[PDB]
């Protein structure tokens, strides 16, 4: 890939190519896939001389063996050279069954053998080499040309075309593509698509919407105007529709869109999908690909946090190798502990391990969970904190470097890691630790050169009274309209300004009252095998659905009379975000509003939501992340 990239820079700028090649052969520890490098690089050198004419030199040095020797180095259009004393056989000592004479392997004896090289050159490092080789055999063929003589003769016989003014090594940079947006592709479905389609109207941008067959007649498609576009992706499930990145890019190219909003879920947080758009010159609304890989790779997110004096959640800090490694790091932290997948997220593959006796079997087990779920068995260890708050802090940042941190949220009422009752503040978090997580968000935002909207996640240990960085969301977070209310700053509009190339210096983050979000989901109550109450999805047609108009609540929704909730997608049917002066008032208004809200046809999670808002411990604000499954058993 580096050889193809270089021959491309040489074809663009009209450079002669010089190569110094030494190899033990093709890397066998890369699999059978490594062999194709012989034909890839050889084809790019065949095409480079046959389309661009510029001479390729191949100075074989050291040991020059295996597939590097057997392809591009000795290719019939290149000027093949060897340094004195170069070992040049088809394969090296690792593969060769028995001794090969220096007459058939050393470049000296091959110098006069026809078609072996255009010349044997002097080795300019080994001072006495040609006299050391003449003392071994005086009838050995000696080198004649220098590397400087071959290069000056190669350069001077060419036509000296007038050189253009120098450019840098041109790479994927969204900041160049960031131009004013009047038509945007929205890569989303559901409540996230309704949110982004609403923001597109509010910023005066036309939507190009893409959708699956159930979602062609969804509420985000109905919200579109005659000037907005809807395009069929086909199929029912995510695999047949939204996860086809080439179909979505081909729509971005066809409609000639000014930018692409990568949404939330699907391919939103993938640096591969960000790179795919920016390769083809399509502006990606969010951070740089560099910022996404630095804070998306879990080991490197911890190492960047360590460099910025931000405490991390204590663990292995890199990735674990084996079960013996997992036992030793777990013992140093103190049991119980966590095993997590690197390519995880959404609570998937997070195993708690209680003992060293358990860890030997539970490492092998959770490595199989990660390998089954993602195709990578890589575990990394973290300290299991039992009493915590999931605190998360919203960052905005432009290309100029203004790290406008909007405020925090507490998302501790959660069921199977999925957030349920989310808040604008934390009732157990000291103002000093709040100030520490605000400072750490700025340090990370500036030191990764982050752009767009992002959310850094913190564990706020209730037992220790400490805040620890866990990971980062390198995209838009579903909890965002809670912080839109309380910061006084619109997160998607600021992101659309940033992705238009504008500055966010002018913004003033506030702390306007309090806010809370309940995620309204289409789920029915049902008992488990021991008799503890669970919620599980209820698909079907909605017959009646009324959300009364109220000034201090925001409703993002896909539920309406005559619409169906699809079994191929999530039960999230609305986000109901209450605002108010104080926390008791926000809880009481949200409790009263949930009773004024009506849903029929489907079942909904609302019988549970009403009871959490009428709990005394929740009204006092005294809980942790494991509150909800305990409370559902009460």
């Amino acid at each position: 890939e580096k050889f193809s990239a270089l021959l491309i820079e040489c074809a663009k700028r009209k450079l002669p190519v010089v190569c110094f090649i030494s190899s033990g052969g093709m890397q066998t520890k890369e699999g059978a896939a490594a062999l194709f490098s012989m034909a890839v690089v050889n084809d790019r050198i065949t095409r480079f001389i046959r389309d661009n004419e510029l001479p390729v030199l191949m100075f074989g040095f050291g040991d020059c063996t295996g597939g590097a020797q057997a392809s591009f180095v000795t290719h019939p259009l290149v000027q093949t050279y060897y340094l004195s004393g170069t070992n040049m056989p088809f394969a090296g000592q690792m593969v060769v069954p028995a001794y090969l004479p220096s007459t058939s392997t050393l470049s000296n004896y091959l110098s006069k053998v026809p078609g072996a090289m255009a010349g044997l050159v002097h080795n300019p490092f080994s001072e006495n080499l040609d006299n050391q080789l003449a003392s071994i055999d005086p009838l050995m063929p000696m080198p004649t040309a220098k590397i400087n003589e071959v290069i000056i003769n190669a350069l001077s016989t060419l036509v000296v075309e007038a050189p253009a003014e120098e450019e840098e090594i041109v790479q994927n940079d969204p900041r160049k593509l960031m131009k004013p947006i009047n038509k945007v592709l929205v890569h989303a479905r559901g409540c996230t698509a309704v949110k982004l389609i609403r923001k597109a109207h509010d910023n005066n941008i036309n939507v190009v919407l893409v959708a699956s067959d159930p979602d062609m007649t969804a509420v985000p498609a109905d919200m579109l105007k005659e000037s907005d576009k809807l395009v069929c992706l086909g199929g029912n499930t995510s695999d047949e529709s939204y996860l086809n990145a080439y179909s979505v890019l081909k729509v971005a190219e066809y409609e000639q869109v000014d930018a692409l909003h990568p949404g939330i879920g699907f391919l939103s947080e993938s640096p591969q999908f960000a790179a795919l758009c920016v390769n083809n010159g399509v502006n990606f609304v969010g951070p740089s690909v560099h910022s996404m890989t630095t804070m998306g790779n879990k080991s490197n997110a911890i190492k960047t946090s360590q460099a910025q004096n931000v405490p991390v959640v204590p663990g292995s800090h890199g990735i674990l190798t084996n079960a013996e490694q997992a036992v030793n790091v777990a013992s140093e932290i103190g049991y119980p502990v966590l095993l997590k997948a690197v390519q995880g997220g959404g609570g998937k593959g997070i195993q708690v391990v209680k003992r060293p006796e358990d860890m030997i079997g539970l490492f092998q087990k959770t490595a199989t969970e990660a390998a089954a779920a993602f195709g990578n068995g890589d575990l990394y260890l973290e300290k299991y904190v039992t009493s915590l708050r999931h605190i998360e802090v919203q960052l905005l940042r432009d290309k100029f470097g203004h790290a406008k941190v909007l405020g925090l949220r507490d998302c501790s009422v959660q069921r199977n890691n999925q957030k349920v009752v989310e808040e604008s503040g934390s009732t157990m978090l000291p103002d000093e630790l709040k100030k520490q997580v605000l400072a750490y968000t700025r340090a990370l935002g500036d030191a990764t050169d982050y752009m767009g909207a992002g959310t850094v996640e913190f564990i706020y240990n209730l037992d220790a009274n400490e805040v620890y960085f866990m990971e980062m969301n390198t995209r838009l977070q579903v909890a965002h309209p809670v912080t839109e209310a309380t910061s006084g700053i619109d997160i998607v509009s600021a992101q659309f300004d940033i992705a238009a190339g504008r500055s966010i210096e002018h913004l003033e983050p506030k702390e306007i009252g309090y806010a809370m979000e309940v995620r309204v989901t289409a789920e029915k109550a049902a008992l488990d095998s021991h008799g503890v109450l669970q919620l599980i999805p209820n698909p079907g047609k909605i017959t009646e659905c009324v959300f009364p108009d109220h000034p201090d609540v925001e409703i993002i929704s896909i539920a309406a009379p005559g619409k169906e909730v699809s079994p191929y997608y999530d039960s999230l049917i609305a986000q109901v975000i209450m605002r108010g002066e104080n926390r008791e008032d926000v809880i009481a208004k949200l409790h009263a509003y949930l009773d004024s809200v009506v849903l029929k046809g489907i079942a909904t999670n609302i019988p549970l939501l009403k009871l959490i808002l009428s709990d005394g411990t929740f009204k006092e604000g005294v809980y942790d992340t494991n509150y909800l499954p305990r409370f559902m058993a009460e």
Partner: protein, 363 residues
Amino acid sequence: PLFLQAEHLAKDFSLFPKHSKQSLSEEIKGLLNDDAIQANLKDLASLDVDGYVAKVIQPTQDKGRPGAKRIIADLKGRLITETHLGSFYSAEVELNFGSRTRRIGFIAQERTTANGAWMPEHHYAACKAIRHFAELSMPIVYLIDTPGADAGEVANSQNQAHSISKAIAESANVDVPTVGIVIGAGYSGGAIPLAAANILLSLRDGIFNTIQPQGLQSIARKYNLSWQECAKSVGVSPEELYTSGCIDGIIDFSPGDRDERQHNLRRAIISSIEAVERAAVNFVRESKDLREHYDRSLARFLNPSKNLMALELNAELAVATSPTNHHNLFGSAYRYLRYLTLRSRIHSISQEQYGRLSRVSVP
């Protein structure tokens, strides 16, 4: 500028392998389905190293296994020419495509001479044969079967590397549909001029790998394994090669079968050549730059400029050796497609992308 475009497209198509249009594995009629491949992955996972060696490695080593000529004869077409030259076997057979008969070129590694181990003159014969089929517009089926090309003293004295570098150069730049089919073992630089095809297939019990599994013994000594452990760790079964994206499917045929499965080899060839030709026509429908590349290559045949004309004389390459034997516009499409598939078979990442290992609890 097609040279810049093919690295762009192949980088795009390697960012998400599954939903890419480089997936032609649905087209070929006579392959095993993805369910049988998943079931064979479960068996190879649950088996040990000896059970893996018995399933995968031992049938490709079998001396009773039908040779390249016997497999080509049991396509049941009409042979027009043959060239047996040691472990090289080129041929030319008319196959029925249903609408009419068609000349299909062959270049095969014959296991019944030197075990399929190629010498310098066999690579020079493969160079010549690849131009010869291009000059006559004949699609080529490559048949891969080798312990690797010879690393011996006679080979390197005859400049072995320099014959293979030309053979890969002709194969990469040939103006006809190329299909690879592994009929035994595809080891090292002897396997890659033939496996450099548009669509690389394998028979049900074939193998494709970086070197022969006994050559991993040096790396096994260095890290204290056996060479059999290193061979399973590398993952050399047709199922694992299809999972990694090295090959485009597993043909439901093994050289000794005599049931319904012997008919799958000609059917897989017919539907592969038809699939590459439909795909190449679709590329000429949508690429206006493929015209510009062809016109720039045509202008060199009209006016051969002295510096590249002298290079073509000394290099002896597959060029327009006549206006009649000059390639078509679709010829340049087979080069283009062949690069996109070869370049999406290779894969690399970055230092920022790679997940760092734990320094903690390491003596």
